[PDB]
């Protein structure tokens, strides 16, 4: 049994898989090899397979801000990207955002289009950021040492120091 790699396919015998860009049309026999037929126009198959039909290419919806980076072939799917300077939300680039924001407890290090998405940092001790923002940096804690004020409430990465007398 066992069956070799990049050949795989077992069913009383060991058959060769179809090369990427080819669908499976007929199984192999004792004396005949596996029969594979190429994928049709607008269709693909990206791996050594035993698939009887090819998959359709994904479309880069202009209304989603998508633009085709690489036209799909019979072995690879269409690769999409954003308009620029729009940024992909996933590695798959299935949606675009102008830029990402930095949630409370995080501050910005800017967004300059073309790979340059917002760089966030986690607010060091003595700094805070309430609000979700794509421009706001971490702000420093009040003082409570200026007018020789108290301290009253600690001060978080999300909240500021609150002071009395």
């Amino acid at each position, epitope marked *: 049994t066992a069956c070799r790699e990049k050949q795989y396919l077992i069913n009383s015998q060991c058959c060769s898989l179809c090369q990427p860009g080819q669908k499976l049309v007929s199984d192999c026999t004792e004396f005949t090899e596996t029969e594979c037929l190429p994928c049709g126009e607008s269709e693909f198959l990206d791996t050594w397979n035993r698939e009887t039909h090819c998959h359709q290419h994904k479309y880069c919806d202009p209304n989603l801000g998508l633009r085709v980076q690489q036209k799909g072939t019979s072995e690879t799917d269409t690769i999409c990207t954003c308009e620029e*300077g729009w940024h992909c939300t996933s590695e798959a680039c299935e949606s675009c955002v102008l830029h990402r*924001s930095c949630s409370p407890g995080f501050g910005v290090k800017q967004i*300059a289009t073309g790979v340059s998405d917002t760089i966030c940092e986690p607010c060091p001790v003595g700094f805070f950021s309430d609000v979700s923002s794509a421009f706001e940096k971490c702000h420093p804690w009040t003082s409570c040492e200026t007018k020789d004020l108290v301290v009253q409430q600690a001060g978080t990465d999300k909240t500021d120091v609150v002071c009395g007398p």
Partner: nanobody
Amino acid sequence: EVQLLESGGGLVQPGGSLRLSCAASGFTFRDYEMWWVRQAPGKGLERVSAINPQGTRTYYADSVMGRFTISRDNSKNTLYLQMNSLRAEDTAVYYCAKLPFTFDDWGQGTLVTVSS
């Protein structure tokens, strides 16, 4: 449901000034961070300015600092951009964007042309 309707954009002479507005509807405008972005024809997308919900904190691009002013009327649910000392580089289509800045979270645009 988000509608952002830019206006104020027209043909102005260099050195001149314009006031752009973005009328928001379909969301609680007073609670969202807003941005102004411009796109020159052919040339790249550029982030001009940004404002926090209360209108107390702002950001400006180095290329527009000192000449441009972002502001908001949370009663009327409108965002503004006062453009002064206008130059030909400022010729672009101006858009306004709503956080979380999806391709659905921005307007139709308003054309600003700076020439003689």
